[PDB]
């Protein structure tokens, strides 16, 4: 009696936002409602242009998220640990120095397991600072 269990109990008029809804449905139907757009379990459509458009967009936004939110944490950790162990110590550097450090981190990422090991293993006799430099 308070709320109807039937979808027929309308809450708005039939003409509410008709135009924008028609534009949205036109956007949806033009490429999808076609004979050659036969989906595989609703997930893989038959239209080539759908792939061609959606794959790049998905990759783009995922990459933006990864670069500006996820890998940034590793980069900041490397900068902090290698240059004082504190955020203020890193901020004591200039922007150019931070750029150099971050690009070296990118180098390390690109090398991964297929590259020289002197980037993280100190050869004997090297004059550069060791692990106990800030301790």
């Amino acid at each position: 009696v308070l709320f109807s269990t039937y979808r027929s109990s309308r809450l708005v008029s039939k003409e509410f936002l008709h135009g924008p809804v028609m534009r949205f449905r036109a956007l949806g139907e033009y490429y999808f409602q076609r004979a050659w757009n036969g989906t595989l379990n609703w997930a893989l459509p038959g239209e080539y242009r759908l792939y061609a458009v959606m794959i790049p967009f998905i990759y783009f936004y995922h990459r933006w998220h990864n670069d500006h939110t996820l890998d940034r944490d590793h980069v900041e950790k490397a900068m902090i640990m290698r240059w004082g162990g504190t955020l203020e110590d890193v901020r004591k550097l200039s922007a150019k120095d931070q750029l150099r450090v971050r690009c070296f981190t990118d180098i390390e990422k690109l090398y991964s397991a297929y590259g020289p090991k002197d980037t993280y293993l100190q050869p004997p006799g090297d004059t550069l600072p060791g692990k106990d430099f800030y301790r």
Partner: protein, 231 residues
């Protein structure tokens, strides 16, 4: 501890809303055998043998939205955890098993005692019944383990190969301008071939693994179905 997070399907949910506000026919299904259990006419079953269709279709859609799109770089399989897959398979398998057990028909289990009366009951048939009862749960575990391991291994291999390709492409492309350009060209062609092969293999394997995942459940259901003949 309460962690608040989100799945990686929001754009796909948006696309589903956009492209399925109007009806469309479906004619290609990853696991079609859930719709055709009976192949000989005049055979019928009093049990709700078509109850699995909706769950099958939804599971296929969900796992396809995750796994197939995971081939795109940086796409996350949010559900990729061993025990979470265990929970999913537990739900489905144990629900169907308890549906069969709540029927309170003990004769349904007569086939568990393998063999004929000729075989010794205690030393052969009983041991076989023990093994088969164990094998049901083992089938559940194998289903979930297979689904987990396939994705894990495929994506590990893809990540490693992509790392190697990035390394050689970035730090050895200058060889194109050098006298050893032929070696680099050969390596680059091999890497492209490997890239294409891996992508095709992963695409096929995802769908096939989903097919097998649904087929294990359907086999569980079919092992306890009995068909009457119309007269």
């Amino acid at each position: 501890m309460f962690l608040f997070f989100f799945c990686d399907l929001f754009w796909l949910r948006l696309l589903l809303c956009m492209y399925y506000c109007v009806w469309s026919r479906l004619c290609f299904i990853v696991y079609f055998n859930c719709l055709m259990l009976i192949f000989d006419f005049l055979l019928f079953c009093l049990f709700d043998l078509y109850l699995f269709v909706g769950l099958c279709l939804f599971l296929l859609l969900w796992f396809m939205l995750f796994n197939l799109y995971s081939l795109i770089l940086y796409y996350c399989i949010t559900y990729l955890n061993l025990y979470l897959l265990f929970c999913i398979v537990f739900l489905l398998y144990i629900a169907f098993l308890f549906l069969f057990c709540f029927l309170c028909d003990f004769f349904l289990f007569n086939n568990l005692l393998v063999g004929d009366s000729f075989m010794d009951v205690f030393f052969i048939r009983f041991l076989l019944c023990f093994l088969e009862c164990f094998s049901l749960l083992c089938r559940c575990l194998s289903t979930f383990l297979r689904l987990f391991c396939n994705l894990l291994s495929s994506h590990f291999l893809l990540l490693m190969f992509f790392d190697f390709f990035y390394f050689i492409f970035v730090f050895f492309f200058y060889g194109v301008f050098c006298y050893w350009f032929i070696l680099f060209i050969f390596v680059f062609c091999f890497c492209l071939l490997f890239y294409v092969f891996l992508y095709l293999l992963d695409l096929f394997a995802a769908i096939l693994q989903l097919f097998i995942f649904c087929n294990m459940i359907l086999q569980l259901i079919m092992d306890f179905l009995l068909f009457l003949l119309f007269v």
